[PDB]
Structure formats: structure tokens, C-alpha cells
Enzyme design. Structure first.
Site, PDB file in Angstrom:
ATOM      1  N   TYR A  26      -5.870 -53.002 -11.320  1.00 15.74           N
ATOM      2  CA  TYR A  26      -7.017 -52.315 -11.743  1.00 15.74           C
ATOM      3  C   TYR A  26      -6.746 -51.481 -13.090  1.00 15.74           C
ATOM      4  CZ  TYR A  26      -5.120 -47.820  -9.950  1.00 15.74           C
ATOM      5  OH  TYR A  26      -4.239 -46.880  -9.545  1.00 15.74           O
ATOM      6  N   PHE A  36      -7.558 -43.936 -18.519  1.00 17.70           N
ATOM      7  CA  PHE A  36      -6.506 -42.882 -17.984  1.00 17.70           C
ATOM      8  C   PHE A  36      -5.829 -43.745 -16.842  1.00 17.70           C
ATOM      9  CE2 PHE A  36      -8.476 -42.013 -13.659  1.00 17.70           C
ATOM     10  CZ  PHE A  36      -9.608 -42.688 -13.709  1.00 17.70           C
ATOM     11  N   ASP A  37      -6.102 -44.770 -16.376  1.00 19.47           N
ATOM     12  CA  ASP A  37      -5.481 -45.468 -15.250  1.00 19.47           C
ATOM     13  C   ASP A  37      -5.433 -46.979 -15.491  1.00 19.47           C
ATOM     14  OD1 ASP A  37      -4.765 -43.626 -13.661  1.00 19.47           O
ATOM     15  OD2 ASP A  37      -6.285 -44.172 -11.917  1.00 19.47           O
ATOM     16  N   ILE A  56     -10.207 -43.009  -2.679  1.00 20.54           N
ATOM     17  CA  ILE A  56     -11.993 -42.415  -2.667  1.00 20.54           C
ATOM     18  C   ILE A  56     -12.890 -43.481  -1.862  1.00 20.54           C
ATOM     19  CG2 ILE A  56     -11.570 -41.003  -4.499  1.00 20.54           C
ATOM     20  CD1 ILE A  56     -12.398 -43.104  -6.645  1.00 20.54           C
ATOM     21  N   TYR A  82     -14.067 -37.586  -7.209  1.00 18.60           N
ATOM     22  CA  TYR A  82     -13.352 -36.481  -6.986  1.00 18.60           C
ATOM     23  C   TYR A  82     -14.616 -35.361  -6.924  1.00 18.60           C
ATOM     24  CZ  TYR A  82      -9.381 -38.985  -7.894  1.00 18.60           C
ATOM     25  OH  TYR A  82      -8.219 -39.735  -7.950  1.00 18.60           O
ATOM     26  N   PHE A  99     -14.060 -48.794 -13.056  1.00 24.06           N
ATOM     27  CA  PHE A  99     -12.813 -49.229 -12.958  1.00 24.06           C
ATOM     28  C   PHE A  99     -12.925 -50.929 -13.209  1.00 24.06           C
ATOM     29  CE2 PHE A  99     -12.246 -45.497 -10.400  1.00 24.06           C
ATOM     30  CZ  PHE A  99     -10.745 -45.345 -10.708  1.00 24.06           C
TER      31      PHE A  99
END
Lengths: 107, 131, 513, 145, 330, 48, 92
Positions: A26, A36-37, A56, A82, A99
Site C-alpha cells: 500500500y 506519508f506511508d 484501523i 485516528y 490509500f
């Protein structure tokens, strides 16, 4: 909730269920296109299991909604993310997460 | 003892030739270097530091005496007593104060007393030109 | 890094040879003992050998066995020639490895030549680099000294205790990892958890020498110094408990902890002493039940604790009126701890140390304010009057109440502690019959401090016997508020120690009331 | 003259002479501080900080007096920085003055001077670090913003 | 009691301690002279270039300069440094070879002259690179606090000053007069004031503790003892007066006058009066010991040892007092 | 003044009883000045 | 890459991936505690020559066998999608 939009078609019949192990490559990013990911940088697929709420709720719903071999984009609104108590130094206290997930090697 | 609050400048009462060595009983003035005030004796709160305008030879004049007897100075270890000119008063500690003791203070107020004490002798220590 | 690796290899080889040699040494000693016991025809010589070589502490025995380094003294060692030759071969190998006796065939030669060449080539301007090269060169020239200095930290353990040991190490590391971080709540909690995990480990009390070698007591004392230099009382309590337990582990631990007595006593205060385990308790543990440590006590520490006792006896303790209790004018509960420490120092193993007792009584008589309102020349309250006043204070809640702390019981407890301290400071009976001037002077001073009439009168005071009262509900005297027999016990110990029993009539009179 | 009086020793001098000059500077700074010179400079700065701009100061003191207002403010800040530089006690005296230097960070006049003063205070006193709060950090970030 | 019944690990630890105490410690290896000789060689810096006047500092010169820089660094107090101790001990041993010699037989005059020249050259190997100023800086930086580094500095100074070397004395005097500092003499006065004397109370406590003799986790013998609590740091208090007497060796009136009064400074310390005061305190302690032991018929071994230590210290103090007035210093 | 220093005339002194370890205190509580050996200290002058 | 940027990135990698474990192991390296194992007794001070007839020759440092106890390093993989939850301190 979580909005799912397909990018590349998958197998279409082998849908994951509770108690199985799914590996995913991902790439997470903010709503403003601020990445960020990304699991490709680490060169290691991310492994998790449905039913132990390790990830999550939106991610679980998106992973379970889509089938094996499918590349899809998931939009996670803050209440399944979050929320207000976001990651300090990583995620702002109010933002939706985009994502680009691709399911492979379902177990 | 290292701060600048304890610096005193000596000025002989002579009009000129102040650079000559001091003499016993010679009238002079003592000035506070940092504040510019002059030590003097007044009837209303004893001995205080006053401005140059109010500094007169009647109150600002002091002399160095060898001893307490009524009737040149080595720089260190001289035990020179201080006596106010035109008076029989000498610098001494204001008798120990119980309130001061209560505050364990070292501010032993200075008083001009006709007899003072036996510890009225004191030494003079020159500071560096930098200070 | 490579030099450190070489040193570690040397120490590991030394440990391996130590095991190999000690196995053969034990086997040989067993064989010789079997021969000595089976064949005892030379009974005198057999007894001499059994007394000298055997029936001795193991360290002395092994020192005797290894005393064959010189051929002149080798006659006193019954070790076989082969074993001695093996040890000599290992010693020669160690000396050769250490470098004790052109292309630098070895690492040490290469490092030394490199350092010398660098120094000769240019005038180095970096102090850190210069210090590095010179320290490295000194290690190259003094490898044997480096091994000698590294030996004290070396330790050997059984294979069955590695696991827990590793866990202990991990915990220790965490504590060290908390030294560089400023104190905070999370760090405090992790430190408490690590200390508790250190508590529960069996290796902590199984190998006190290993803990001493690791220097965990120094680390925890450093942490306590940081936290004290109040905020975070729980951490101070945990550190004090750890130090007290460490002292209670073994005698050498007590000796090691006795060094910090000055700092522990200086930092001991009313505020620090109010809550939980205290540095004063650490000092008491470091001084309790050890006679030579008691003799090694300096008079400056006794002067400091006497000064603390006088200070708490002059003014009231701030938290007492902070809570709301009526002002009294002095601190009995604060002085109770100092009195307990003083009587711990004076009294050891059921006897009184005359030097410490004389010093303590000299300091006490030098500062009469330590005795409080009673036993005071200016005051002159009297023992019976003071105790009766305390009893009537505790009877009514107008003055007793502001409860966690009751001043009425505090008065009696403090006076009982003072009387007990004076009682155990009395000289021994053998000194009294010896006619020593100092002992007679001390006894006369003690008799002058308190009279016999007060003792008998206060012993004659009754108690609050628990009566049935209401049916099915026992009306018991609630403790820490009323007069307990502990005061009577301590002060009848005083009566026996100082006055004793004069005659039959006095004994009957005392027994009557 | 005072700014030139408190100049730090040169880094190209020898070690011993540099240490001696550093000791002389330290005791001179202590002597000047103990007599209230720092408080006097702070009072002058507070008096001059009432007026926002040079024109506003000219509205009360005239254009001729307001011509050198910015220069005087810069000189005062430089003198304060020189007084507190390299002295642990002088920096620790700013424990209660941390808000005083923080609140003037955004002021356009002598922004570099006040920033240098804050840098000198922070790199020397652990107490100001221990009393640093979130709002001060937010103001420092607003400086970059 | 038998050794064969002990656990293997405990026996291994005991054997390790015994081997460390009996074999490794007793082994002696000499490397100070060789290390100093290797460091003193300049290599080929002068061969590769000679146009530079000062050339480059010798490795030993760089080492002593580094130590001097660390000593001169402004700090609140002087801190422990193992490397400085080790190098100071190495240098002191290197320059102490001739002084230490490293059925009486008569020594020829020529042999004495060669030994003196050897000692002078060994001391010149060190004092020509800044050791004389380094020891003064280290002593001044100690702030009059007893420790191991001040002991090492005093030992190095004694080794340098052995035989009354005039060159090193001139160098230290020139440095002291040029710098015009008061830290050196203040530290000396403090160190002399912290010197210990005979203590009777400590003697009684030690005798009683020995009478107890109860073991503390060491088998049957307590394994707890020091030199003696009656007189500690006797070696240090002898070294201080030996250094002071070596400063005034050779009847040099310059030091004999500088010690009494330090002209040119803001404060003067009279070392001679301090020596007299310490001698008076030692005499009082010896008198108290005599008064205590007068009643006893025979002096025990501990009392004899204490008397020997006190008399040796008094002998050193007397020698220093003789040195202060050996030359006709009025 | 310190221990080991010779005492001189006109110098304040403290007297301690060897047997009782009490100072030669001057009691003034009752209004009549008396002398007694007590734990309070009082200075004395030994004038030749 | 420019020199300052190269040094900065190298130092950043060391600080954010290796600093804590290196510091902990450096602290632990001071002591030498050893268990009694068959590998422990197999350690030889001098490695014998393979050809034979050669002794007193030092082996290459850092290539032998060490048995002193050193706690292993601990790391936690980075992940910013897992649910966000006393709690133990985070790992490197």
C-alpha cells in the site's frame, strides 16, 4: 465510512474472511496529496489479520470489501481513522486518509 | 568584598598636591566612587552619604588617628582609627541588634560614638585600576 | 574497538583455563584427603596436615595451593609437578600473548608505530585526537596493566542461571538508559518497574558479589542524588527500599554502602523523612548489627544528627500546622527517627559501645534543648507532669484533633524513645566493678539527668484496659493514641540499666505498685 | 563605547591569554551587572518600546529626536546581548524575563538583536529550558512563518 | 570447609582472585624508559626540513603541552584523570632511574659523577619540554584538595627536583614570578593545613576492633584492614615537605626569600610559619602518645609502628626546616 | 583564640568542671547573682 | 551529493536507526561475565598453526569466539496504519 474505487481488476471470487492472513503493498497519503506511508520503500509487504483489530476499522473494511489481486483506492474519513487523537508529528488531528492498496497472496 | 559597592575615594582637604602621602590627623573627604556621594555627619540621622552640594568641611572632614588618644600611614596593617574632624566622635558598630540577630544580618550600621570600641581600628586595601 | 576485543579474548581464555585448572585441583585435593583419612599412622603429622592444608576457609586453602610461584617457597605446596608445570605453561602463554618478551606483525606494534609516526609527521592541533592516540598508545605499552584493571569486573556463572541473569542485565540497562533523560512521570514509572523486577530476581540475592561488581548501588544512589537535587517521593522511597534490602543482603554490601553515610545523613530531613522509606533508614541499615562499622563511626555524623534533633526540638514541624493541628512548639515525631538512629548506633549485639555512648551523651548534655520542654532547666516540667499532660491532651479532641498523627501519643513516644536511648547508653556492669572513672562519671551524669522518683511514679501509672462494654462489641483502646506498655518496657530497661535494684525493700516497693 | 568595551576575545589568540581575557571579561560583566546596569538598560528599552514606529515617537519627541530611535534601540539590544553573553548568572537572571524577550520577537525593529539575545539566554541557562512552555515554542515557529 | 565440595563457579571465582593477587600483580614489567625514549626521538622531521626555526614539537613535547593546556583550562574544580596519572607515573619512573639506582662496596668518585650526569640528562629529557611548568599548573589547579592527581604531581615534581637541580628551580621561579599568581601558595597552604597527625581515639577504636576480630562474609578472617587510621596519608605529607625542601635545595637564597614573602603579588603566604605550626601540632600529638603509653610497661607492636611513622614524619619536617635556613638566609 | 594557644591577660575564658562537665554559670533567675556549675556557659576573666 | 548533505543524511540514519542500541551495547561492554559452557572451555588463548610447528602467533582480532553475555538488540518495525491505543516505551 470507507469509499472504495477500483484501479486494476482482481480475481473476483476469492474474498477474504475473518481469521485469515492478508499481505498488502500500500501507499498512504494525506488528503492534499502529501505522502506519508508506502510499503514499497521498505520492500516488504505488510501482513495483518482480520478480526484482531490491529489496524484501523476503515482499513479492515476496505481490505475485506475487495477481492484477491485487486488494486483499489480507499478513502478513510476521520471517524474511522485516528480522528482527533492523530499521530503526533505524522498525521494532523483532522484529516482523511487516501490509500492505494493492492491485495495479493491471501491466506 | 569583591563588588563595586565598597569602593571609597580619598580626597585630601588641601587645595593641591593631593598625590602626596597621607599624614596622621590630616583632614580629608571620603567619597563613594560608584554613587558620587560624600560621607558626612548630620544631626538628623547621624552619619550618612550626602550630595556634593551639601558636602561641607564641617561635616565631611575626617582624620586618621594612631589611637583613641587625643593629644606616613602604611598602606597595609596600620590600624588607623577614624575620627570626625571638629568632633570627638569615632566610627564604630552600632551595638549588636537583637532584631538584626533575628535576621542574622551583617549590616552592622555605622555610628559615630564618642568612645566607640576597641575594634575601631581598620586596614585599607587598594583595588585594581580595572575596578 | 579491536583492542577491546583483544582484552575480552584474553579474559575469556583466562576464565576457561580457570575452570580447567580448578577441576584438576578439586580432584587432587579429594585424592589427598582420602589418603590422609585412610592412612593416619603418623597421627601427629596427619593432624598437622589436616589442620594446615584442610579445615581452613576455601580462599586460604586455594591461596596456599597457589603459593608455588617461587621454587624457594614451592616446598609448602603439596601440588604435583605436572599440575604446577601446567599452570606455569599457562602463565607463560599469557605473558607471551600480552607482549612481554621492521614489519609490525602484530596489531600492537602497528598501532604504536602509527601513533609515533603521526606524532613525528605533523604537530597535531585537535585535543581529542591527541588524547585518543596517546591513550591508545598507553594501552599498547601497558596491556598487562589493562588486564589487571579489567580483572575485577570479570565474573563466572553457572550455565543454569544465564536466563534470569540476562533479564537482570536488561533491567539494569533500562535504568542506565534513564540516566541521560531528565526526570519525568513516565521515566519515574519505568524506573519503579525496573527496580521491582530487580527485586524479584533470584540472582540479585544469590550472587551479591556480582551485583557489587556491576555497581547497581552506585547507579541507584546517583539516581536518588539527581531526584533529590519534594517532587517524585515514590522514586525516593523505592531507592531507599532498594538500598536497605541491598544492605540486608550481605555484610560486604553494608560495608560498601557505609561510605555514603555522610551524604545520606546530611540529606536526611523532616520533609524527606515524612513519607515512606528514608535515607535515614538507609543509614540505620548500613550501621545496624555491624560492630566494626559502629566503631568506625565518626563524631561529626553524631554531631549532625544531634543538631537535627535540637532543631526539631526547638520549633514545630511545618506540615503539622499545615494540616491544621494546634501549634505545640516542637517536633516529637520528627525527633523520634533521630533518637532511633542514635540508639541503633549506640547499641549493637545486646551491648553498649562505650565510645559512641560517651560521644552521644556529651553532645546531648552540650545541647540541653534536645530534651524538649521536660528535663529542661529553664522549663522544669517533669516527667510525670509531661506524661499526664500528654494523656489529658489525648483524652479530649479539642487539642488532639486538628486523625493520621496524634500529638498526645507523639509526646509519650518521643519521651519513651529518649529514655530508652539514655538507658542503653549506660556503661557495662563489668566497667562499673572495674572502677573506671569514665564509667562512673557517665553513670553519675545519667543519674543526674532523671531521678528514680519519676521512674517509679510513671511506672505506677495504669493503662486503659479493654472492657467488654457494649454486648458483642469490644471497646478496645485504639492504638497510637493512648499510653501503650512500650514506653514502660523501654523505661524499665532504663531503670535496670542505670539504677538497678538497690535492695530487697526497693524491689518489693517497685513490685507493689 | 560600552559595546566595544565588552567585546569577546579573539579566537586566534593563544590559549592562556584567551583564558585570561575571558576571566577579565567575566568579572567585568559581573561588576557591571551587580550595580543594576542591566536593569537600567531594561528600563530604557521598556521606555522606548511604547512607541511602535519612528513617526509615532516623533509625534511626542519631534523628528530630530526620532531620527536615531531605531539606532538607539539596536544599540541597546546589542549592549544587552554583550552584557549577558557568556555569563551563566546573567542568563539565569532572565528566568523571570523569558516572556519579556519572547513577546518582542515579532517586533520589526532589532529583530536580529532580540533573536540573538534569546539565543544567548537559551544556550547558557538550563532553567529557561526547564520553564519553556508551548506558547513560546509556537511564537518561535511563528518567527519562521 | 573442604574445597572439593564447593560449587564450580564459586571455586573458579576464588581461583581467579587468588591468581590475580599472587601471580599477575607480583609480575613486574619495565616499559617506562623505553616508552620515554621512543617518544623523545624526533624521527626525521629535522631531516626532511630544517628551515623552520622552532621546527615541530616532539611527541613528548606535544603530550606535556596537552596536559598543560588541560591544567590551564578554566574550570570550577580539578577532576579525576586516569591518563594523566598513568603518564605522570611513567615520566616520574623514567626520570627516577638514576636516583633509585635502576658487605658495603665503595663507590668511585668517577662513578658518582657519571651517575649524577645520567640523572641530570634524564631530568633534562623532561624539564626541557615544559614539565616544570606543568607540575606548577597542576598543583595550582588542585585548589588545595587532597587527591590522587596531586600526589602524582608531587611525585613527578620530586623526581624532577631530585639532587637539587638548579635549572628546574630557576624555571619554576621564573614562571612563578612572571605569572604573579596566588593559587599555588594558597593551594600549598591548604594542603599543609589538611595534613593529619597521631590520633589516640582512632588508635583505641582500632585496637578494640582488632580485639573483636569477627568475620564479615570472608570465612574466618574479616579481611578488612588498612594501613592505619591513626595516621593516614603519611606518604603524602612526607612528599609535600620533600618537594618543599627540594625547592630550596642547594642554598639558593632566591627560593629561601620567595617562600617567606611573595613580593609583587597581592597576597603573601609564609610557608615557614606553616611548617612550624605543623611541627608544633605533631609534637603535641607525640606528647599525648607518650603520656598515654607511659603507664604501660612494654610498648606493643601497634604503638611501635605508630611511633615510627610519627618520628619519620617529624624527621622529614626537621629536614625541610634545616633546608630553609641552611644557607645564611637572614 | 584556639586550643593550644597561650592564654593572655584580659582574655575571656570558659571554665568546665572535669568531674561534672558543667560550666561555671552565673545564675540570675532569682534576682540574686550567684555562681553554680550548670550546663549554661558564662565567660570569666582571670585578672592577675 | 554535497558534503554537508551527505554528512547530515549519514548522521540522520545513524541517529534514527542505530544510536540507542549502540549506546546500550557500549554501556554493557564494560563488564565481562561468562557462563560455564562447552563452548567456553573450548576457547584457546593461542590458535595453533594449521600447518604445524608454529606457535606464539596472534590470531586476527575480532575473529575468535566470544561467550560473554550481552543482551540482544530489540527493534520494532515502523507502521503508521495500525490502530493507535503502563504502555512500554517504543522500540527503535
Amino acid at each position: 465510512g470507507v469509499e472504495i474505487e477500483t484501479i486494476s481488476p482482481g480475481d473476483g471470487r476469492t474474498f477474504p474472511k475473518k481469521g485469515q492472513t492478508c499481505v498488502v503493498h500500500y501507499t498512504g497519503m494525506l488528503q492534499n496529496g502529501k505522502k506519508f506511508d508506502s510499503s514499497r520503500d521498505r520492500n516488504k509487504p505488510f501482513k495483518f489479520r482480520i478480526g484482531k483489530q490491529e489496524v484501523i476499522k476503515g482499513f479492515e473494511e476496505g481490505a475485506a470489501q475487495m477481492s484477491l489481486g485487486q488494486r483499489a483506492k480507499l478513502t478513510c474519513t476521520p471517524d474511522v481513522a485516528y480522528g482527533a487523537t492523530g499521530h503526533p508529528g505524522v498525521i494532523p488531528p483532522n484529516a482523511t486518509l487516501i490509500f492505494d492498496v493492492e491485495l495479493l497472496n491471501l491466506e | 568584598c569583591t563588588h563595586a559597592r565598597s569602593l571609597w575615594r580619598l580626597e585630601p582637604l588641601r587645595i593641591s598636591w593631593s598625590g602626596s602621602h597621607l599624614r596622621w590627623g590630616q583632614p580629608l573627604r571620603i567619597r563613594h566612587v560608584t554613587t558620587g556621594r560624600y560621607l558626612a555627619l548630620t544631626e538628623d540621622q547621624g552619619l550618612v552619604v550626602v550630595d556634593a552640594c551639601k558636602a561641607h568641611t564641617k561635616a565631611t572632614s575626617f582624620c586618621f588617628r594612631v589611637s583613641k588618644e587625643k593629644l606616613e600611614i602604611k598602606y597595609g596593617e596600620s590600624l588607623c582609627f577614624v575620627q570626625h574632624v571638629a568632633s570627638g566622635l569615632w566610627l564604630t558598630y552600632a551595638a549588636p541588634d537583637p532584631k538584626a540577630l533575628r535576621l542574622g544580618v551583617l549590616k552592622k550600621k555605622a555610628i559615630l560614638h564618642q568612645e566607640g570600641h576597641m575594634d575601631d581600628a581598620l586596614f585599607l586595601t587598594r583595588c585594581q585600576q580595572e575596578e | 574497538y579491536f583492542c577491546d576485543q583483544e582484552l575480552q579474548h584474553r579474559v575469556e581464555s583466562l576464565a576457561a583455563f580457570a575452570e580447567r585448572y580448578v577441576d584438576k585441583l578439586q580432584a587432587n585435593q579429594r585424592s589427598r584427603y582420602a589418603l590422609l583419612m585412610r592412612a593416619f599412622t603418623m597421627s601427629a603429622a596427619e593432624t598437622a596436615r589436616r589442620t594446615r592444608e584442610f579445615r581452613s576457609p576455601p580462599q586460604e586453602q586455594i591461596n596456599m595451593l597457589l603459593h608455588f610461584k617461587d621454587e624457594a617457597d614451592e616446598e609448602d605446596c603439596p601440588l604435583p609437578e605436572d599440575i604446577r608445570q601446567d599452570l606455569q605453561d599457562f602463565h607463560q602463554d599469557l605473558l607471551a600473548h600480552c607482549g612481554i618478551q621492521k614489519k609490525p606483525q602484530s596489531l600492537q606494534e602497528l598501532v604504536s608505530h602509527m601513533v609515533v609516526r603521526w606524532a613525528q609527521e605533523d604537530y597535531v592541533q585537535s585535543p581529542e585526537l591527541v588524547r585518543a592516540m596517546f591513550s591508545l598508545l598507553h594501552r599498547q605499552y601497558d596491556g598487562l596493566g589493562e588486564l589487571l584493571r579489567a580483572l575485577p569486573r570479570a565474573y563466572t556463572i553457572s550455565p543454569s542461571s544465564v536466563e534470569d541473569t540476562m533479564s537482570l542485565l536488561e533491567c539494569l540497562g533500562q535504568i542506565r538508559s534513564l540516566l541521560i533523560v531528565q526526570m519525568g512521570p513516565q521515566e519515574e514509572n519505568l524506573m519503579i518497574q525496573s527496580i521491582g523486577n530487580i527485586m524479584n530476581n533470584k540472582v540479585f540475592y544469590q550472587h551479591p558479589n556480582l551485583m557489587r561488581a556491576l555497581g547497581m548501588h552506585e547507579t541507584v544512589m546517583e539516581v536518588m542524588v539527581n531526584v533529590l537535587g519534594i517532587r517524585f517521593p515514590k522514586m525516593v522511597t523505592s531507592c531507599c527500599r532498594f538500598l536497605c534490602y541491598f544492605c540486608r543482603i550481605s555484610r560486604q554490601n553494608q560495608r560498601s554502602m557505609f561510605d555514603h553515610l555522610s551524604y545520606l545523613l546530611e540529606n536526611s530531613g523532616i520533609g524527606l523523612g515524612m513519607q515512606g522509606s528514608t535515607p535515614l533508614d538507609v543509614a540505620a541499615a548500613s550501621v545496624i548489627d555491624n560492630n566494626e562499622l559502629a566503631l568506625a563511626l565518626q563524631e561529626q555524623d553524631l554531631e549532625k544528627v544531634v543538631s537535627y534533633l535540637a532543631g526539631c526540638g526547638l520549633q514545630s514541624c511545618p506540615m503539622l500546622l499545615a494540616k491544621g493541628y494546634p501549634d505545640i512548639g516542637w517536633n516529637p515525631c520528627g525527633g523520634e527517627r533521630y533518637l532511633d538512629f542514635l540508639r541503633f548506633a549506640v547499641f549493637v549485639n545486646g551491648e553498649s559501645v562505650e565510645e559512641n555512648a560517651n560521644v552521644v551523651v556529651r553532645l546531648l548534655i552540650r545541647k540541653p534543648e534536645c530534651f524538649g520542654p521536660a528535663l529542661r532547666g529553664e522549663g522544669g516540667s517533669g516527667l510525670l507532669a509531661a506524661i499526664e499532660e500528654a494523656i489529658r491532651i489525648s483524652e479530649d479532641p479539642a487539642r488532639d484533633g486538628p486523625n493520621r498523627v496524634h500529638l498526645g501519643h507523639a509526646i509519650m513516644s518521643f519521651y519513651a524513645a529518649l529514655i530508652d536511648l539514655l538507658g542503653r547508653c549506660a556503661p557495662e556492669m563489668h566497667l562499673i566493678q572495674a572502677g573506671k572513672g569514665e564509667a562512673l562519671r557517665i553513670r553519675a551524669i545519667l543519674r543526674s539527668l532523671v531521678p528514680l522518683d519519676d521512674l517509679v511514679g510513671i511506672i505506677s501509672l495504669p493503662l486503659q484496659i479493654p472492657t467488654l462494654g457494649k454486648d458483642g462489641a469490644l471497646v478496645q483502646p485504639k492504638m497510637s493514641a493512648s499510653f501503650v506498655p512500650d514506653h514502660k518496657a523501654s523505661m524499665v530497661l532504663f531503670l535496670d540499666r542505670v539504677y538497678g535494684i538497690e535492695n530487697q525493700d526497693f524491689l518489693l516497693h517497685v513490685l507493689d505498685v | 563605547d560600552l559595546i566595544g568595551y565588552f567585546e569577546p576575545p579573539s579566537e586566534e589568540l593563544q590559549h592562556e591569554e584567551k583564558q585570561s581575557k575571558l576571566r577579565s571579561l567575566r568579572n567585568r560583566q559581573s561588576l557591571f551587572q551587580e550595580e543594576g546596569m542591566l536593569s537600567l538598560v531594561l528600563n530604557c528599552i521598556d521606555r522606548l518600546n511604547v512607541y511602535t514606529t519612528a513617526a509615532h515617537f516623533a509625534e511626542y519627541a519631534g523628528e530630530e529626536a526620532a531620527e536615531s530611535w531605531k539606532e538607539i534601540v539596536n544599540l541597546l539590544y546589542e549592549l544587552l546581548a554583550s552584557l549577558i553573553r557568556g555569563n551563566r548568572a546573567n542568563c539565569a537572571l532572565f528566568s523571570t524575563n523569558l516572556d519579556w524577550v519572547v513577546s518582542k520577537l515579532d517586533r520589526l525593529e532589532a529583530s536580529s538583536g532580540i533573536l540573538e539575545v534569546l539565543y544567548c539566554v537559551l544556550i547558557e541557562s538550563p532553567e529557561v529550558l526547564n520553564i519553556i512552555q508551548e506558547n513560546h515554542i509556537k511564537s518561535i515557529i511563528s518567527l519562521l512563518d | 570447609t573442604p574445597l572439593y565440595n564447593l560449587p564450580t563457579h564459586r571455586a573458579c571465582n576464588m581461583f581467579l582472585e587468588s591468581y590475580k593477587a599472587a601471580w599477575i600483580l607480583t609480575e613486574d614489567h619495565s616499559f617506562e624508559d623505553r616508552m620515554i625514549d621512543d617518544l623523545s626521538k624526533a624521527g626525521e622531521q629535522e631531516e626532511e626540513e630544517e628551515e623552520v626555526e622552532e621546527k615541530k614539537p616532539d611527541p613528548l613535547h606535544q603530550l606535556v603541552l596537552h596536559f598543560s593546556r588541560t591544567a590551564l583550562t578554566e574550570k570550577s574544580k580539578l577532576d579525576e584523570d586516569y591518563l594523566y596519572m598513568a603518564y605522570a607515573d611513567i615520566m616520574a619512573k623514567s626520570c627516577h632511574l638514576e636516583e633509585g639506582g635502576e658487605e658495603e662496596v665503595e663507590v668511585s668518585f668517577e662513578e658518582k659523577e657519571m651517575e649524577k650526569q645520567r640523572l641530570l640528562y634524564q631530568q633534562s629529557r623532561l624539564h626541557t619540554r615544559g614539565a616544570a611548568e606543568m607540575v606548577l599548573q597542576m598543583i595550582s589547579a588542585c585548589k588545595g584538595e587532597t587527591g590522587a592527581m596531586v600526589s602524582s604531581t608531587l611525585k613527578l615534581g620530586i623526581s624532577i627536583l631530585n639532587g637539587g637541580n638548579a635549572e628546574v628551580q630557576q624555571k619554576m621561579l621564573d614562571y612563578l614570578k612572571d605569572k604573579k599568581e596566588v593559587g599555588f601558595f594558597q593551594s600549598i597552604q591548604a594542603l599543609m593545613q589538611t595534613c593529619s597527625v597521631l590520633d589516640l581515639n582512632a588508635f583505641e577504636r582500632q585496637n578494640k576492633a582488632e580485639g573483636l576480630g569477627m568475620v564479615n562474609e570472608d570465612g574466618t578472617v574479616i579481611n578488612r584492614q588498612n594501613g592505619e587510621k591513626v595516621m593516614a596519608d603519611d606518604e603524602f605529607t612526607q612528599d609535600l615537605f620533600r618537594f618543599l625542601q627540594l625547592l630550596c635545595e642547594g642554598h639558593n637564597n632566591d627560593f629561601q626569600n620567595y617562600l617567606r614573602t611573595q613580593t609583587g603579588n597581592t597576597t603573601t603566604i609564609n610557608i615557614i610559619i606553616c611548617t612550624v605550626d605543623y611541627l608544633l601540632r605533631l609534637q603535641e600529638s607525640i606528647s599525648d602518645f607518650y603520656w598515654y603509653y607511659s603507664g604501660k610497661d612494654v610498648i606493643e607492636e601497634q604503638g611501635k609502628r605508630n611511633f615510627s611513622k610519627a618520628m619519620s614524619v617529624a624527621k622529614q619536617v626537621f629536614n625541610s626546616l634545616t633546608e630553609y635556613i641552611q644557607g645564611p638566609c637572614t | 583564640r584556639s586550643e593550644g594557644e597561650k592564654v593572655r591577660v584580659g582574655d575571656d575564658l570558659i571554665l568546665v568542671s572535669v568531674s561534672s562537665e558543667r560550666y561555671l554559670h552565673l545564675s540570675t533567675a532569682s534576682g540574686e547573682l550567684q555562681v553554680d556549675a550548670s550546663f549554661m556557659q558564662t565567660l570569666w576573666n582571670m585578672n592577675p | 551529493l554535497p558534503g554537508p548533505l551527505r554528512a547530515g543524511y549519514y548522521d540522520l540514519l545513524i541517529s534514527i536507526h542505530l544510536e540507542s542500541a549502540c549506546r546500550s551495547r557500549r554501556s554493557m561492554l564494560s563488564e565481562y561475565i561468562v557462563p560455564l559452557t562447552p563452548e567456553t572451555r573450548a576457547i584457546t588463548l593461542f590458535p595453533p598453526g594449521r600447518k604445524g610447528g608454529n606457535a606464539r602467533r596472534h590470531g586476527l582480532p575480532g575473529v575468535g569466539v566470544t561467550t560473554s553475555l550481552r543482551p540482544p538488540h530489540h527493534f520494532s518495525p515502523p507502521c503508521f496504519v495500525a490502530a493507535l491505543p503502563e504502555a512500554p516505551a517504543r522500540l527503535s
